[PDB]
Design a protein around this ligand. Structure first.
Ligand SMILES: CC(=O)[C@H]1CC[C@H]2[C@@H]3CCC4=CC(=O)CC[C@]4(C)[C@H]3CC[C@]12C
Ligand SMILES: CC(=O)[C@H]1CC[C@H]2[C@@H]3CCC4=CC(=O)CC[C@]4(C)[C@H]3CC[C@]12C
Ligand SMILES: CC(=O)[C@H]1CC[C@H]2[C@@H]3CCC4=CC(=O)CC[C@]4(C)[C@H]3CC[C@]12C
Ligand SMILES: CC(=O)[C@H]1CC[C@H]2[C@@H]3CCC4=CC(=O)CC[C@]4(C)[C@H]3CC[C@]12C
Ligand SMILES: [Cl-]
Ligand SMILES: [Cl-]
Lengths: 114, 118, 114, 118
């Protein structure tokens, strides 16, 4: 079984900590990144349909130093070692609806255990 | 005059999304109802941004589909349009379940959705 | 048959003109947008496997006033009226490889005939 | 010391992409070879940016798959890495063929690819 609970890092030296997943798949945690270091909360869910050993999942990071919001989704894989393959959408704040077209960046991130 | 996530929302596909109270930290929960004339209903959880108490906040949420192994995340902004209507402009990523990490490349879709009140 | 040749516009009052598609699917054209108006070239291909009435396609716009590049892909649909449902990636120029993570915006565009 | 598109490229999946001469307007053509141990080979066409004659230009291209009704577009930048190696960091969209405009939402994938010389 691949579980999101615990501590994770990526190629950018990030520090992601996720708490216990309840039975409905819900979780909370923390996302720590450089700018000097800031902590921001994350809330998310993990699939529990068919209790897959390698579940898909999703979460939102509500950045504390910034008007933006990021969303991540992906799958917890086994390779023996655990890895989260993710993709993300970073939403910037824009002042007027007609600037919406440029408000959204996309990318990826690979996480592995501390 | 502020744009809130709380309430009933629909899009051009007749989905109905219903969002509860946004708390002091911007957290909220809700439901995503969609035709799958057969209807299924899945929980969602996420946040809206609170930094500078913006009239048009950014936000994000995860829908944990009840009938599927997939997961979808939405992000976007709650705008007041020219006509005074509140609209959510969103983009999303839909993650499918694959068996081998070598299939990861084909597992992620992207699209968009515009929601208005119902 | 849905063909990319001709003149197209979208909700942003853009003006896109595409030339003749050869037999391998290749095409050239022009993308015109506000900033005052600038013309930039586009080169692309259209699928010709199975000669579908509603082909998928792709093109790159090489913006003339800017270091960026945009790519579009999508499908030419019939609804009697013709419409291109697209999605796009806008690539910004960043000065150093470790800023790559923020160089890519994503979005959409619907085109219809002039 | 400039990063050029011209040449042979590979990624972490053993695709081999080969790009011809970049002309004065930045246009180029090439080939994308990929396992589909069975190999298929499809044309690609696109541009690199020339505004300010940058040492690390942005670019984009379309691969017109020979064995499929799909289309894929790549965009990214040609960087000189810390070790002096040229690397293409790319993101892509893969468009599938669907029959009805109502299925359009499920037709577009997104991923990434990192290429290095071969
Ligand atoms: C690579 C990646 O996943 C992206 C998506 C959201 C991004 C963060 C968004 C907010 C941000 C603002 C900064 O000023 C420093 C870097 C950070 C903290 C970003 C680091 C890279 C992230 C984590
Ligand atoms: C258009 C859009 O926002 C997408 C993102 C995730 C998609 C859903 C993912 C799961 C799903 C499976 C189906 O068989 C039809 C309806 C649904 C419920 C999809 C409808 C369209 C959605 C809501
Ligand atoms: C909506 C959309 O497709 C986006 C993708 C690329 C975008 C263009 C990218 C370059 C650009 C720079 C400007 O200064 C004005 C607007 C334009 C001309 C953009 C208009 C919206 C476009 C066309
Ligand atoms: C990882 C990546 O960049 C993706 C984008 C488009 C994808 C290709 C699309 C068509 C295709 C069909 C197959 O059956 C296997 C190989 C290929 C050739 C895919 C391999 C991975 C590609 C190249
Ligand atoms: Cl922006
Ligand atoms: Cl940028």
């Amino acid at each position: 079984k691949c579980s999101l609970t615990g501590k994770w890092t990526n190629r950018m030296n990030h520090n992601m900590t996720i708490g216990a997943v309840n039975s409905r798949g819900e979780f909370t945690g923390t996302y720590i990144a450089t700018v000097e270091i800031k902590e921001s909360p994350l809330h998310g869910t993990q699939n529990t349909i068919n209790k897959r050993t390698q579940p898909t999942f999703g979460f939102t990071v509500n950045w504390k130093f910034s008007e933006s919001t990021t969303v991540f989704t992906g799958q917890c894989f086994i390779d023996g070692k655990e890895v989260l393959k993710t993709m993300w959408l970073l939403r910037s704040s824009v002042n007027d609806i007609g600037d919406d077209w440029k408000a959204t960046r996309v990318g990826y991130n690979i996480f592995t255990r501390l």
